[PDB]
């Protein structure tokens, strides 16, 4: 018809199994409501029967859609379909539906009530002839093929009617695959590196006879690594089994288990095979075990094995419908003659999730293992501070084993045999959750994390200026280029912090980074002493070739004076004012790009005894005195610090307010520490005096804190910074000259 | 029946090699005093008659089991017995008790007087016919198999009796094992280890089916180490010919 009936399909973000979200404006054009019957004309005569419902997620021209009902109509991620309604569907009086025996093995007992009725109620479902859906339960994720229909040929279902399920499961027919293949649906995290890595690849695998008319070369050799376990080989066969290619599987120990010519043999009849199915992917992880670092090979046949990958991968750029994929465990352990032009140019990096993707990567995989009620995952998002997701199906594996060793084990072995009804009475605790998290948990990081901060403006009180114009500093020249290439001055890149220990120093490079939405990655003064004495700077070009694969980043240095305080005071040792690692980043800072997006944020308290090289222009160049709190930053701070905690209301902190002055921060946010210390101990001894009053229940004497623990607390509270040092640092304002 | 008379072995804290501990609420249920003589029926129709005494180291419903006593049942750990009591034993007249000829190699004298006489007096044993005990001593442990009772078929055995020993040592049948090989009895020390490796391989090894109904992969590469001489390899067949599996050793 060619008018806007068109449409190409995509990803779902709802978890029905057969509901279709569209977008507003689309939905006013078709002229319908929620919840109408609608149906989807496809490729191969296939078709779809969908309740349709309204989203804002949804663009102009898309359809959210579902990864079994587009294997239903036999079509794939790429396809256009076509969309109609069908508003005359009746209710029917029998179902027919019956399963596949590939899927359904171990099982024993009643199939019909255990998974049919807790499905088909309350949820008028439509359903048409020929049609495979999905369900889970019992550990278990079961599909179920339909036969015949008495409203034929389709029908709406409801809690009046029956199903009849009698008979025999049938054979899977030669077309489709199973849905035990892995997908787009069960990675969880990362999802900026999957649209990136789809964007990469789409052209020469969906269309490519495009490139059989247009000779441009596509990029063909794209490099992910990734810290071990993170399921790279997992991505890999995702991606290259939902844009439906090829595949095959060259893994490196198999390769070198094999004599020499045998595996010339194996790999030239691999790459022979891959050239066979084209277009295809092709796929070799552990290259470690076949190309490592040219220093740590020894022998005779690596280098002829090297040799011949990179004859073998040279000799295939006459054909241009296979592309290649690696994987290795680190950048710095491939050797250097592979990654170069012509063999291996892109480069992807997956890293290590974070507390949204530990919770999306939970949530695939307690899919279907039917929770209780007081379990929490935002519990165990939260407390999971540096794991891997092989680590999390550990994780919920151990603690499904658990609910297993616990009950539903010695009760049944005494009287009866185990069967599936009695797992769909299983769940599993929080307590097994706890359990499972406090033991047998083998945290495999101790790296760099990288991050977005969540520490936001009005977690810090007052120092408001000081903020307006750092959003002046860093949020202007990348929302606004043609100003600045109007008045042609190219903008500073540095940044300088400093003043007085104990004033928050890193809440606000956490507050530009969480606003701007940047990553964040920081380095403490340790690492500068770690690198200092074991005389090992190959590591800051690591770190600064992380940070340009972080685009866009800050990047935060505290205690910058522990390598100049760490050799002598002032006088310091026999040396003078330089160092060696301070050059050292002096010298990787200067030689990078201005338009990068990478910003660098130096943090000091003795902004005296520091190098002054560091001060010339194209550098850290800005200095900000971050003084002493004053009374309303100090009301604004007690009330930012004490929101978490819960407090009296009759309690009136302006009197300890208009007492202190010249404290720090971090001691008005130590005392609170204090008192909170002081009410749980008499909580807890006052809990205890009651227990052991009439039993030798539960009126709480009080949650929060009066006026006792803070008097107290007064009572055991000490000033950190002396006079001295403010007259020290008020020499700078007294003089005023701060350029070299 | 379907009642509580089913129950699962464990191993014992006792060391005599045949009594058997169970707790105060089950031995309140089932109506007893102590040195009762109770009756146990497992697997294969085997039987065993014990003597039973009272600990507060049982818990709700387990069974405190000896070694010797639970490879007489010809069942493993991790199976189900049957608690009868029989109060109706009487004494004998004559005890029929010969070796096995692959566990006494090297003995010279008489075997009556050394072994027999020191482990039958002041210890009213409960026998029954086709039962393996086993003694110790003589810098060896030599275990004894009876064939014939007068009141047949099981009696207990007194200070006033006598058992004829006569005959030549018999070769072992084809189904049991010996008792020279290793098992839980034999390793001090570092209990906690070994619960925790029981732990976390029983479910496999113990009930193959069920992860044959669910897919959900167990642990598979579990490694433990230590200084050497500690006895890896010990530990390893033991937990290996407890659980009763097939062995190999790379
Ligand atoms: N509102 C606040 N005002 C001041 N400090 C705060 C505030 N909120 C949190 N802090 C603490 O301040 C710390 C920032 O370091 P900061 O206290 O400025 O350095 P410092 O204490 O002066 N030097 P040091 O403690 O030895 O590393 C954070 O880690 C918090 O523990
Ligand atoms: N983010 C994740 N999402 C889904 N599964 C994961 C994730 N991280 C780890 N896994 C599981 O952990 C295992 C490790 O992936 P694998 O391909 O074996 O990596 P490697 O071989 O490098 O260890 C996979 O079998 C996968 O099922």
Redesign the interface.
Known sequence: KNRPNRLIVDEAINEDNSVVSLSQPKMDELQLFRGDTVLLKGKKRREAVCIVLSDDECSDEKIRMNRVVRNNLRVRLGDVISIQPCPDVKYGKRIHVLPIDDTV????GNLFEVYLKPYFLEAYRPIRKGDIFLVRGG??AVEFKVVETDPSPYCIVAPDTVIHCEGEPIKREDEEESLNEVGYDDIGGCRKQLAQIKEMVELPLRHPALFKAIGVKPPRGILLYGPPGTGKTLIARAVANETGAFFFLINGPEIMSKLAGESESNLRKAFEEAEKNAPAIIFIDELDAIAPKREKTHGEVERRIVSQLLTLMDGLKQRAHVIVMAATNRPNSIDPALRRFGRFDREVDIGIPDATGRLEILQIHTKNMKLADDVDLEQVANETHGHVGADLA?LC?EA??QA??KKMD?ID???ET?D?EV?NSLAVTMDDFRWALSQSNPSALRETVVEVPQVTWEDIGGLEDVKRELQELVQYPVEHPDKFLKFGMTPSKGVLFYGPPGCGKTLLAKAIANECQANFISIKGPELLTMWFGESEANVREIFDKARQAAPCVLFFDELDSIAKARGGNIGDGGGAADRVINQILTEMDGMSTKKNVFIIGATNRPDIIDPAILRPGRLDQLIYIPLPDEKSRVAILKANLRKSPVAKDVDLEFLAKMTNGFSGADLTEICQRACKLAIRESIESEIRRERERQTEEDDPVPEIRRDHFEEAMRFARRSVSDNDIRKYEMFAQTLQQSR
């Open positions: 093995e171990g099982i024993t550990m278990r550990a594996s499904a084993l297993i060793r010695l072995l005494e009287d185990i599936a797992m």
